[PDB]
Design an enzyme around this catalytic site. Structure first.
Site: not given
Lengths: 226, 226
Positions: A185, A115, A132
């Site tokens: 991401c 991630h 995030d």
């Protein structure tokens, strides 16, 4: 309202997702090299690799520096993970020839397993912020950076760091647009940083991601941010 | 009704959320160690750590094997991350002494940043399924696993894997109970897996999570599933 990718630009883009010399150097800059193979990680819903992210981040750093924009230092992707696992000593060298205190913004891409996330030191706002696109909170990562700034201040300028007024925090899920595709991401990290380094509000969503991938291929190829 | 936690069991549980030797080993099994500190990740609205999840998953492994139940191999939590980032070669060894094809079900806990998800290979059903309690979709994860099975088939059995009739799936938001609290995501993964390994339908909701945390404390301490 986003800059259009003309038919002609789409042609430059399609061409590089073609197969061929996986080693072919498509873009060389900032010590980095983008090959056909790196560029392919921008395709479909492929996960971005580090070369794309670093290359992008350096384009933002190169763009800061034009007048009116806040000045920016981008840390390379391996920095945070090396700092976390091994401590200040293992990264202290990465900043010879760089005065991290003479810029407005520090960009710190954060790799947590598969991630991507991003932390940002803004010296103007006197704060350290975590972004995030899954909405995870990472208190720790900001403290780790505060602690780094302290140890950098001591080591580079012979003075302790002044934490007065300094605020550490994570942006919550409702405050920034969230991902739907895991593989996007790295794209969120890059585009979060694009807006922030321009002092523009983060004003896209998940639906713009196919467009952003195509665009970044184009941008990287020309070393021109649109 | 879900099995009741009695006054007598409530007291086993209160006691372990006591302060004291954070390193006191409360449970030792499956080559794992659960300390008081690991156990406290089950309290409150704390995020479960890897030790808790691996320990639980191993309890599921151990429970399968009682007669009538489908046989289960659970992969360790770092497995999928290591496979994704580094490829088959970096996890090939984790299955010396294990014939992954001689069991009915494979459990793959998937860690995406702070978040937990779960993938399941069911050899009887001839398919690979993804469960995410925020309803995210991860096609890629299932393919990476199918790719893994093929590489494992070649590596361990000297035969290519037969993908005919095999289907790759994410479970949709309306199909499986969704989380409300980010911190409970690991619990969703664990509990999805509880139901699936028993061939029972997934029959709880977010409201059951406080109960499920207290119960898992108790279960881990006794190395006994209720």
């Amino acid at each position: 309202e986003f800059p259009e990718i003309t038919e002609e630009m789409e042609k430059e883009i399609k061409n590089v997702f073609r197969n061929g010399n996986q080693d072919e150097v498509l873009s060389e800059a900032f010590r980095l090299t983008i090959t056909r193979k790196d560029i392919q990680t921008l395709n479909h819903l492929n996960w971005l690799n580090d070369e794309i992210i670093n290359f992008y981040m350096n384009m933002l750093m190169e763009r800061s520096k034009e007048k009116g924009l806040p000045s920016v230092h981008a840390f390379n992707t391996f920095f945070f993970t090396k700092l976390k696992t091994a401590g200040y000593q293992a990264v202290k060298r990465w900043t010879k020839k760089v005065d991290v205190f003479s810029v407005d913004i520090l960009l710190v891409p954060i790799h947590l397993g598969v991630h991507w996330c991003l932390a940002v030191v803004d010296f103007r706002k006197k704060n350290i912020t975590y972004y995030d696109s899954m909405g995870g909170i990472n208190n720790e990562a900001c403290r780790i950076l505060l602690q780094y700034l302290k140890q950098e201040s001591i080591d580079k300028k012979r003075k302790e760091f002044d934490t007065n007024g300094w605020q550490l925090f994570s942006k919550k899920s409702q405050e920034i647009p969230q991902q739907m595709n895991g593989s996007d991401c790295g794209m969120f990290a890059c585009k979060y940083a694009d807006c922030i380094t321009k002092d523009r509000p983060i004003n896209f969503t998940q639906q713009h991601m196919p467009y952003f991938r195509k665009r970044m291929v184009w941008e990287i190829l020309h070393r021109k941010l649109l």
